[PDB]
């Protein structure tokens, strides 16, 4: 039936991914019915975005997520707000906010004067 799966579309050593709704009778990089997110497993936490009002449409109508996408909808909280679990808030974490490019440059001018 309808699956929610990942699609490998990066370089050779950089496996980027997209969370895509497709049929089970389809290859990986086929036609997705709708692309709803992305997943980059190379940053230091990760880079995870789920649209969270389209992932509620497809779960309510019968799309079975695969086993590594099921771990992602539990993290962002879109699975718990569909089955009615008390982990409904998102437990995802973003990377550390680095000091920007302008800030380091002004820190170096004051370091000399």
């Amino acid at each position: 039936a309808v699956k929610i799966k990942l699609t490998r579309l990066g370089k050779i050593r950089n496996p980027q991914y997209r969370v895509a709704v497709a049929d089970a009778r389809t290859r990986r990089d086929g036609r997705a019915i709708e692309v709803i997110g992305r997943y980059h497993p190379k940053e230091e936490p990760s880079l995870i975005e789920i649209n969270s009002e389209r992932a509620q449409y497809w779960l309510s109508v019968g799309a079975q997520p695969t086993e590594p996408v099921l771990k992602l909808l539990k993290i962002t909280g879109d699975w718990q707000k569909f089955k009615g679990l008390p982990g409904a808030q998102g437990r995802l974490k973003v990377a550390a906010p680095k000091p920007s490019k302008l800030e380091v440059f002004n820190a170096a001018l004051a370091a000399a004067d």
Binding site: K101, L102, V104, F105, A108, L109, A111, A112
Partner: protein, 200 residues
């Protein structure tokens, strides 16, 4: 590949001293070879070819790499000869020359190539790195107490530092303010003939 040959020989053919000061040039300011003193035929293709050769061997850039610089100079807004010299100037070996950390262009290429420089704490060893705005160009902590780096300390006054970069004190680290437009670029060459060369 690099040229790795005589440097005055390609300053004599172009009739223009390319490196900064040379005594082998101005004793023989005519092109080399056994037919060196002959009257050359002033073509229009010769004025356009040799003007492009002034830009390659001043910077040490091969033809398939200099052509890709033209393919994005004509594609950016503004002019074409302006932005060609803009992206040629932002090469990191040209940053070391203008900041007064090297004698000639061929040793500013090695000091980047042998890995004596960081940028954002990132160890670079490519001469064709294009520094953006607000980049710091720092020297390695290991590469102090070194002979070609201590000779660049007391000799920080004889050549002018351009206004688009700034050098600071006991840490010899270069701060890039903006990409240079036209005026602070040194001019041994006119720029509109390189644009007219590729139009052929």
């Amino acid at each position: 590949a690099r040229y790795t040959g005589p440097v005055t020989r390609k300053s004599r053919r172009l009739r223009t001293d390319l490196v900064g000061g040379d005594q082998a040039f101005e004793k023989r300011p005519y092109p080399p070879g056994q037919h060196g003193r002959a009257r050359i035929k002033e073509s229009e293709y010769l004025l356009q070819l040799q003007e492009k050769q002034k830009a390659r061997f001043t910077y040490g850039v091969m033809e398939k790499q200099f052509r890709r610089y033209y393919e994005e100079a004509v594609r950016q807004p503004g002019k074409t000869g302006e932005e060609l010299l803009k992206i040629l100037e932002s090469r990191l070996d040209n940053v070391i020359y203008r900041a007064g950390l090297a004698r000639t262009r061929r040793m500013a290429r090695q000091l980047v190539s042998h890995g004596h420089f960081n940028v954002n704490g990132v160890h670079v060893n490519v001469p064709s790195y294009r520094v953006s705005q607000y980049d710091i160009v720092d020297v390695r902590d290991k590469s102090l107490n070194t002979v070609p780096f201590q000779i660049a300390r007391e000799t920080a006054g004889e050549r002018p530092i351009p206004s688009w970069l700034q050098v600071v004190g006991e840490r010899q680290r270069v701060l890039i303010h903006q990409l240079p437009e036209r005026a602070q670029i040194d001019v041994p060459l006119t720029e509109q003939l390189i644009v007219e060369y590729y139009s052929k």
